[PDB]
Amino acid sequence: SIVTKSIVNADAEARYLSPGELDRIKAFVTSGESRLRIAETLTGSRERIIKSAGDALFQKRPDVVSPGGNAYGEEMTATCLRDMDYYLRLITYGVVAGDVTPIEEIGLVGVREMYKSLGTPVDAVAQAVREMKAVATGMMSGDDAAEAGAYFDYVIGAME
Amino acid sequence: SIVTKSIVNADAEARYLSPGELDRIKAFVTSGESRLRIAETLTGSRERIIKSAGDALFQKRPDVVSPGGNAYGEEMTATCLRDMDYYLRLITYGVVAGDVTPIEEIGLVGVREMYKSLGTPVDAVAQAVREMKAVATGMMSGDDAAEAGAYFDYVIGAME
Amino acid sequence: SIVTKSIVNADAEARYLSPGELDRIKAFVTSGESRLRIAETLTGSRERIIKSAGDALFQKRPDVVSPGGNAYGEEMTATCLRDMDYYLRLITYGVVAGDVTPIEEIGLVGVREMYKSLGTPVDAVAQAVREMKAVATGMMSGDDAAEAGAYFDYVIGAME
Amino acid sequence: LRDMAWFLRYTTYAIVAGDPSILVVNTRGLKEVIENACSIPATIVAIQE
Amino acid sequence: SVVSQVILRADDELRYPSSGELSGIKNFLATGAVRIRIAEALADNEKKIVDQAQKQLFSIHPEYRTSGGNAATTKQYNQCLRDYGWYLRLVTYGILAGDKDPIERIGLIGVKEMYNALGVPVPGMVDAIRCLKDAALGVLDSEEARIAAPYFDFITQAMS
Amino acid sequence: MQDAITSVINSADVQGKYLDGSAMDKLKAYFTTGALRVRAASTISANAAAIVKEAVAKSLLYSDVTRPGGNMYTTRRYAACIRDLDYYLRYATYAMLAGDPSILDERVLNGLKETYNSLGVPVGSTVQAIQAMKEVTAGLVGADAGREMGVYFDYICSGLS
Amino acid sequence: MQDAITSVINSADVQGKYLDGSAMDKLKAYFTTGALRVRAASTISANAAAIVKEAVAKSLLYSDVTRPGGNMYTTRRYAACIRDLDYYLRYATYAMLAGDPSILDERVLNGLKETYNSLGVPVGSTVQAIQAMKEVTAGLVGADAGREMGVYFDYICSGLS
Amino acid sequence: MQDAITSVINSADVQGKYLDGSAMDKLKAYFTTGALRVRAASTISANAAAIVKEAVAKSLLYSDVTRPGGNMYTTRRYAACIRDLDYYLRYATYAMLAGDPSILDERVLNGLKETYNSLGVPVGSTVQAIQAMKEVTAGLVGADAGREMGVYFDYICSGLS
Amino acid sequence: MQDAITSVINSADVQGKYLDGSAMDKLKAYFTTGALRVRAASTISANAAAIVKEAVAKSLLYSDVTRPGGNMYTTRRYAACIRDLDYYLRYATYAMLAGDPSILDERVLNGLKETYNSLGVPVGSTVQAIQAMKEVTAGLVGADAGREMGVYFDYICSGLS
Amino acid sequence: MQDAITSVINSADVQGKYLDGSAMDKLKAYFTTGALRVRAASTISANAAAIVKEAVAKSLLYSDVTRPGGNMYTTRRYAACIRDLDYYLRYATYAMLAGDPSILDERVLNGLKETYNSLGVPVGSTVQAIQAMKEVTAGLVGADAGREMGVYFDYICSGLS
Amino acid sequence: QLPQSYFNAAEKRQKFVMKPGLSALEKNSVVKAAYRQIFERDITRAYSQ
Amino acid sequence: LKRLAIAQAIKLSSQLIVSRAANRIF
Amino acid sequence: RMFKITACVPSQSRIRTQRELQNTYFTKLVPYDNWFREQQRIMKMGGKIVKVQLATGKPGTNTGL
Ligand SMILES: CCC1=C(C)/C(=C/C2=NC(=C\c3[nH]c(/C=C4\NC(=O)[C@H](C)[C@H]4CC)c(C)c3CCC(=O)O)/C(CCC(=O)O)=C2C)NC1=O
Ligand SMILES: CCC1=C(C)/C(=C/C2=NC(=C\c3[nH]c(/C=C4\NC(=O)[C@H](C)[C@H]4CC)c(C)c3CCC(=O)O)/C(CCC(=O)O)=C2C)NC1=O
Numbered sequence A, B, C: 001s002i003v004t005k006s007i008v009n010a011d012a013e014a015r016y017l018s019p020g021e022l023d024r025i026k027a028f029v030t031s032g033e034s035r036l037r038i039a040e041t042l043t044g045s046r047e048r049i050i051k052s053a054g055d056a057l058f059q060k061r062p063d064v065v066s067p068g069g070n071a072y073g074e075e076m077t078a079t080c081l082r083d084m085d086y087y088l089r090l091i092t093y094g095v096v097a098g099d100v101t102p103i104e105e106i107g108l109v110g111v112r113e114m115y116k117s118l119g120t121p122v123d124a125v126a127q128a129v130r131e132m133k134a135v136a137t138g139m140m141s142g143d144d145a146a147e148a149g150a151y152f153d154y155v156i157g158a159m160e
Numbered sequence D: 001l002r003d004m005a006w007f008l009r010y011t012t013y014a015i016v017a018g019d020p021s022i023l024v025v026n027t028r029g030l031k032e033v034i035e036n037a038c039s040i041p042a043t044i045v046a047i048q049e
Numbered sequence E: 001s002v003v004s005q006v007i008l009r010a011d012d013e014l015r016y017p018s019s020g021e022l023s024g025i026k027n028f029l030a031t032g033a034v035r036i037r038i039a040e041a042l043a044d045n046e047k048k049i050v051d052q053a054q055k056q057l058f059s060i061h062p063e064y065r066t067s068g069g070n071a072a073t074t075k076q077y078n079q080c081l082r083d084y085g086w087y088l089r090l091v092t093y094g095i096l097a098g099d100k101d102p103i104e105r106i107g108l109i110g111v112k113e114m115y116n117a118l119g120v121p122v123p124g125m126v127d128a129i130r131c132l133k134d135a136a137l138g139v140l141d142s143e144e145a146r147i148a149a150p151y152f153d154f155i156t157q158a159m160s
Numbered sequence F, G, H, I, J: 001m002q003d004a005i006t007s008v009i010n011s012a013d014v015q016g017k018y019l020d021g022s023a024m025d026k027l028k029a030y031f032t033t034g035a036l037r038v039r040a041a042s043t044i045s046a047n048a049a050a051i052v053k054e055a056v057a058k059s060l061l062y063s064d065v066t067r068p069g070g071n072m073y074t075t076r077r078y079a080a081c082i083r084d085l086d087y088y089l090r091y092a093t094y095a096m097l098a099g100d101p102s103i104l105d106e107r108v109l110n111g112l113k114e115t116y117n118s119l120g121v122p123v124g125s126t127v128q129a130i131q132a133m134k135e136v137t138a139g140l141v142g143a144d145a146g147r148e149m150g151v152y153f154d155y156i157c158s159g160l161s
Numbered sequence K: 001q002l003p004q005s006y007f008n009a010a011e012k013r014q015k016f017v018m019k020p021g022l023s024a025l026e027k028n029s030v031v032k033a034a035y036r037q038i039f040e041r042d043i044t045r046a047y048s049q
Numbered sequence L: 001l002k003r004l005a006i007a008q009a010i011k012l013s014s015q016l017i018v019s020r021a022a023n024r025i026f
Numbered sequence M: 001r002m003f004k005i006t007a008c009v010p011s012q013s014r015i016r017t018q019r020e021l022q023n024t025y026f027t028k029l030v031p032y033d034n035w036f037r038e039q040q041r042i043m044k045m046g047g048k049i050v051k052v053q054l055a056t057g058k059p060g061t062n063t064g065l
């Protein structure tokens, strides 16, 4: 989170927290209410986000659902929507924590090695998170969509 | 400053600025108006701050002005008030920059070596900044006194 | 090559070439005639290899030539066959050199970054080299097909 | 008599092993161990023989 | 020398030389005059010292003069004598610095590499320096022989 | 190393569940206490050396441990003792800011007992020194900030004992 | 490495003077432009790989440098070229956020000419690539944010040439 | 670290004896099996990632360990699991080439149990993963080369358990 | 670092062309000379110290440079001289095996002139020492192997001068 | 790095001659002055910080260089200036003890001019500071010990200028 | 002191030297060796870190 | 296998090699 | 801030330890904070410093390194 990152960055430097880092933690502490509102917005409507994003993804990239692709069949499409659900859950964690160390430290480090061992195109996963971002920022107000799109932006950036 | 610290901390990590650091820079950018108001408050009344703080310091620590101390005599007391003026100027710089890297990076790194080479008690200098903090936070509103007292607090903490 | 690899591996170890490495270089020196025969087999029939492998690839993976894929259109299909020609040329270089350091050191290091920046599915490129391997090992004798299929095998392995 | 055996032993071990390092790391500093003992060119023509 | 060792060791730990090191410096510099006298006496008689040491060395080892040795031809034999003279010169140098420092720096760091790069055995050099030792000890008294002897034994130590 | 936010996220992730109302309430509790944590951390960063020297002046000075034979006898041992107490105060400040004592058993209490038992450091005397440091900083920052400092000071004393 | 604030403070400190009205006006100018800088930095962080690949698709693709004999020929050279262009875009974003090009000549333009001249890298082709990157990102973020990006892109092209 | 040749030489040297007929017969056995060892090592070097991903697809995928709460859950843990399985296959190839499992207990099985017990890694699930890797590579290289691979795979599973 | 094969492949790749008949003829020339290169490398590996000490006995011994004031005077300087000559013979053997002097100007002749000019090492005396080393090894391995050794020895002497 | 003894031995060795009467007389001169060198070194080791602070109080204090804009302005620059003057006094003590200024141009005056010219350090002001340090220590240790200190102080000022 | 008989009879470690002259995969393998030595495990290719 | 053949030949006849060495040397 | 230094450091210990060779006469960018211990260490080993040049400093600043 923000507090972990500030504590570690002051911790290597053998110093206390600088006052600028302290008002950073203070501003994050005050903005936590809007962060929790964005988290409830993302949590309560996860069904429609995953459904509409999977629909728009398979409309956009039909070869992965065609015979020959990875997510072909009933259980494979269910696992594909499950992976999208995992990434939306990590998006909610990163929205609450105020930083991307939950998202990176859980589901972005060895994502290329894992999806290469599974035989998955990672660009189609980036398109899945892109459609999730489109449905999610179509669901909120302006600054809320920008603050959630920052973390969605980080996930698609960490894909490629 | 805040922008320098965020840029360097993302720069060692070989990554861009995280969105949490970006709203940190955004919140500092919005609070810059109150920072400039605190800076004008500290700048315009520097005469009374230095005068009253020197008076309360020499009342509190009379041995440094007694014969035998460092700041004994006319020019030595003038140099003592000049050193207090230097530290109030660095306080104003740290108030504007939003972080203590002006104060630390100008007048706090080798302060113990310098004041040991001059023969100066550093605790009496900490008392000088304490009286400057008392006069300065007696001069402002509540949150303004807290935000200026953070940097005054950093200077007295970096003394001892 | 083999001589470069043996020289470097003895070079870091601050020693001369061990006699086992020396009979390795000697056996490669004797097998260079069969290597040059495989190279002439691969060089002289490059037209039919590239043509038949492109035909079998677009039969196998028709979505990359369908509108929406990378190699859609006249010049895009020509560039696709040109990339296959590049990889067959590197196969010939690796056949002559006796090791895969020409192939890896020219056209396999940043192949994922390049084909991700172009928007290319790398699995379809692996299928292109697979069809090239099928046509090429359908063109030779048994041990010649095994020795060429080792380098074709390395290229498809370095794709995924 | 033991050393005229032993040279042949580590020759045989080197021949099977494929590297003469087993000979090298032993009979390199061997000379001044046995130079107070005996005649060194006698050992040389012994190994040549 | 002694003062060079004191200065270099004090230069490591970033400090002035302490009182015990300086008092050892004083104790060498007081009795430097006896050293100047014994180096005079070694510089005087060196022809006969090298002469009797050569005679006793080829008493101990007639192997080198005889066929197959290093003292076979008179050019190499003249260099055997010249090596003896250089080593006696280095003994006087080691006496006059008060320590092993210049004699090791000029003639002892890597004698093994040189005399294996040439053909003469190093145990022969051990016996040669011991012959030089009892030769040079017959020309001084005990008050100076106690200063002369252990430099010869240090050469004997660094030979083996 | 995890604060209250990262531990809440780790619990909800090990569940695999979304953030329900109890996690929202825990994060609201941390986001209410965070400003007090910030101000107490600034006040403790103000007076590091004063709190350390008042802790030694309360407990360890004029006792047997600063006399000959004590483990705090020499100037090297005195400087290392001041260093150890500065470490305890600094990491208690970090654990106060995070709101979770995971940094304390990750980075202080990991091999500290075995180090102190190998060196011959008295554990009871340093526990009394940490308790006096806690008493001084609770006199410094007030009642409730002193309590939320003293919970991590008691964590350090419990892991040390 | 200094932003507009640190350079203003450094000028007022090298003077030894307090912050007068001109420094206050400069800092007010930076504190007005900072929100636009933040939003442009977020928009550029959105589309790093797209801006880089559109710059190569505009300038370097289908020319002689991607053909045999060119310095962008091999896959290693292509990957290093994409890496170099990502560096230029990232540091131009940093210099846009700071509002001062000190990071560019501190950390990009320091030994870049001598490196490129030792490797055989064409400087004119990479200057055209940076210019196309500037054109693409100025089409992305608008007129004035594109201009305040293009001033640092022109700084990189001027120091490279 | 010793192959069959070095272990035979070490036995004959610890005896102090010359190489008698039993040692000659052991070395003749190794010099007959060595070409099969070479060809199996080339075939295994061909398909490292395929054998590893087929072992995960047989055992560890779609079970509880890739679900939340499992030790193979996160992408970091998945990448470290693929790394560990690549290590097991690589060192089993080395022990197949040497014809002696001394490298396995020298360099794999040395502190592996204590590492996995400190991390919380399930030993039974990774033993099943190594067994599926053995089954896949024995399907790859044939009957007898698969058997002489499976003896060292069983050595790794026995030292791990 | 590239042999004749890698340089031929690099020329054909920088062209972008396939391996035509001239490249085939160059590789046939290297594959005919390679056995002679192997046997000369074994014969040179046999007598490293003998060739070095015969080169010093021909050129540098009994001259002024081993006398006081010379740069080969002390035992440290003698050992470093033997080390430098062993380096020249070893890298000439490597360049003979590769059939290309790229390793010599990559790893010997890179900063050797500036090192020797900073130390005060005589370049003419070491060039004469390398020439005597060449003469001795050409007496050792024969006419044509001595010539293909002497071309790289002359390369080292030309880059040193 | 060589004292008077090592330089005399090096001259007699580069000659190849034995130690004649002139070398004996030089060593007798050093062995007569050595006790005075020892006592002056102890007296200088007594008052390092006092000599340094009196040199700054004579030359550099209350001038423009401690004012804003000067190179001795900040506390970092003041601490580095005290560090540089302590270096000059310490190495002048070493060169006084050795009786040879070889350590000064080996370890102080090697890259000092280029360092000070790259940093922007005034060389004339630091030469005046070293001269005042020389004046203070010559007032401290007397006439002739002050002279044999001032010869190496003048060596440092000459190599700096 | 370690005898040369002990050093030549030893598991000889490859020393990875970074010269600017080198070929490009050589600088790649040397940087790989530095990532392996400092981070104790190859952190690129196993995490793409 | 050729290295084993020559090693077995050397082992089987080491006694007469050492005896030939014995009357060569002494 | 960084110093683009150029120096030549002979070892004087390779004869005793018998190690392999590192090429001396390097040209490197040293950071400003540890350029001190680096220059001092080059003087400890006895090596001569050829050229010291400030690379990224812009000398005479007070903040911003
Ligand atoms: C929280 C971080 C995290 C992630 C991301 C994760 C992914 C993950 N995805 C899997 C499978 C999968 N994931 C996909 C997903 C996709 N394929 C496509 O074509 C689409 C582009 C895409 C989704 C939109 C598919 C098809 C599989 C099945 C692969 C197979 O059966 O071989 C599996 C193996 C089976 C299992 O245990 O679920 C894991 C562990 N696990 C994690 O812990
Ligand atoms: C901006 C950072 C900065 C600082 C702090 C600074 C201090 C500084 N203080 C000095 C003197 C001094 N400063 C003091 C100050 C004090 N003595 C006391 O007893 C009081 C406790 C205290 C002030 C309230 C005195 C007495 C001197 C004169 C010392 C002497 O004459 O020996 C001097 C030497 C003369 C000069 O050039 O001004 C410097 C450089 N310079 C800097 O650039």
Ligand SMILES: CCC1=C(C)/C(=C/C2=NC(=C\c3[nH]c(/C=C4\NC(=O)[C@H](C)[C@H]4CC)c(C)c3CCC(=O)O)/C(CCC(=O)O)=C2C)NC1=O
Pocket (backbone or CB within 6 Å): C064, C069, C070, C071, C072, C076, C077, C079, C080, C081, C083, C084, C086, C087, C090, C106, C107, C118, C120, C121, C124, C125, C128, G061, G062, G063, G066, G067, G073, G074, G075, G078
């Ligand atoms: C010798 C090593 C080497 C390689 C591999 C290489 C590839 C390479 N492929 C390119 C394009 C391409 N390569 C392909 C190839 C394919 N797309 C598909 O769908 C198929 C699966 C596949 C071929 C069978 C396509 C479609 C493009 C055009 C991409 C575009 O126009 O955006 C380009 C950009 C244009 C150019 O300058 O040629 C390069 C540099 N260059 C090299 O130096």
Ligand SMILES: CCC1=C(C)/C(=C/C2=NC(=C\c3[nH]c(/C=C4\NC(=O)[C@H](C)[C@H]4CC)c(C)c3CCC(=O)O)/C(CCC(=O)O)=C2C)NC1=O
Pocket (backbone or CB within 6 Å): E064, E070, E071, E076, E077, E079, E080, E081, E082, E083, E084, E086, E087, E106, E107, E114, E118, E119, E120, E121, E124, E125, E128, I061, I062, I063, I066, I067, I073, I074, I075, I078
């Ligand atoms: C300053 C320290 C130092 C010394 C002493 C030194 C000696 C030295 N001795 C040499 C040869 C020699 N040295 C000896 C010496 C001996 N043979 C014996 O049997 C005795 C044990 C021993 C002395 C009595 C002989 C016989 C040669 C000629 C070897 C040859 O045939 O090349 C050579 C080569 C040719 C020459 O310049 O004379 C050097 C450089 N080098 C140095 O740097």
Ligand SMILES: CCC1=C(C)/C(=C/C2=NC(=C\c3[nH]c(/C=C4\NC(=O)[C@H](C)[C@H]4CC)c(C)c3CCC(=O)O)/C(CCC(=O)O)=C2C)NC1=O
Pocket (backbone or CB within 6 Å): G065, G070, G071, G072, G076, G077, G078, G080, G081, G082, G084, G085, G087, G088, G107, G108, G109, G112, G115, G119, G121, G122, G125, G126, G129, K024
């Ligand atoms: C952060 C500041 C910074 C920069 C910018 C930087 C650049 C830099 N670019 C390099 C190579 C390169 N740069 C290029 C780029 C180009 N060549 C072309 O033909 C195009 C015109 C142009 C790209 C637009 C290429 C092809 C190489 C590889 C050269 C080679 O491998 O031979 C290298 C050689 C070492 C290595 O690849 O990893 C460095 C150090 N280093 C830095 O620290």
Ligand SMILES: CCC1=C(C)/C(=C/C2=NC(=C\c3[nH]c(/C=C4\NC(=O)[C@H](C)[C@H]4CC)c(C)c3CCC(=O)O)/C(CCC(=O)O)=C2C)NC1=O
Pocket (backbone or CB within 6 Å): H065, H070, H071, H072, H076, H077, H078, H080, H081, H082, H084, H085, H087, H088, H107, H108, H109, H112, H115, H119, H121, H122, H125, H126, H129, K041
């Ligand atoms: C060459 C000999 C050798 C081996 C084998 C080795 C293993 C090893 N595996 C590790 C972790 C790991 N190993 C696994 C593997 C597994 N966990 C599961 O759930 C599966 C059952 C199983 C894979 C089949 C995982 C998930 C981790 C990461 C633990 C963590 O990050 O918390 C670690 C922890 C440090 C690090 O990841 O980089 C080591 C040292 N080290 C060695 O030097």
Ligand SMILES: CCC1=C(C)/C(=C/C2=NC(=C\c3[nH]c(/C=C4\NC(=O)[C@H](C)[C@H]4CC)c(C)c3CCC(=O)O)/C(CCC(=O)O)=C2C)NC1=O
Pocket (backbone or CB within 6 Å): I065, I070, I071, I072, I076, I077, I078, I080, I081, I082, I084, I085, I087, I088, I107, I108, I109, I112, I115, I119, I121, I122, I125, I126, I129, M009, M010, M011, M012, M014, M021, M022, M023, M024
């Ligand atoms: C592998 C490529 C390579 C080479 C060749 C190399 C040479 C090299 N030779 C050196 C010294 C030396 N080289 C010589 C050699 C000579 N002086 C003479 O008088 C003779 C004419 C000549 C020998 C034939 C000597 C005497 C020194 C020592 C200089 C000294 O200690 O002052 C040094 C100084 C540091 C050290 O000794 O260990 C280097 C780096 N380094 C390398 O990395």
Ligand SMILES: CCC1=C(C)/C(=C/C2=NC(=C\c3[nH]c(/C=C4\NC(=O)[C@H](C)[C@H]4CC)c(C)c3CCC(=O)O)/C(CCC(=O)O)=C2C)NC1=O
Pocket (backbone or CB within 6 Å): J065, J070, J071, J072, J076, J077, J078, J080, J081, J082, J084, J085, J087, J088, J107, J108, J109, J112, J115, J119, J121, J122, J125, J126, J129, M032, M035, M036, M039, M040, M060
């Ligand atoms: C042991 C031999 C040796 C010497 C002498 C040496 C000097 C040296 N002095 C330095 C800085 C300095 N030196 C000075 C000194 C002065 N400037 C002034 O205005 C005064 C006239 C003068 C003091 C009397 C200052 C102010 C700096 C800091 C420059 C800066 O921080 O920008 C630096 C820059 C790096 C660092 O501070 O730690 C070096 C390397 N290094 C060495 O290895």
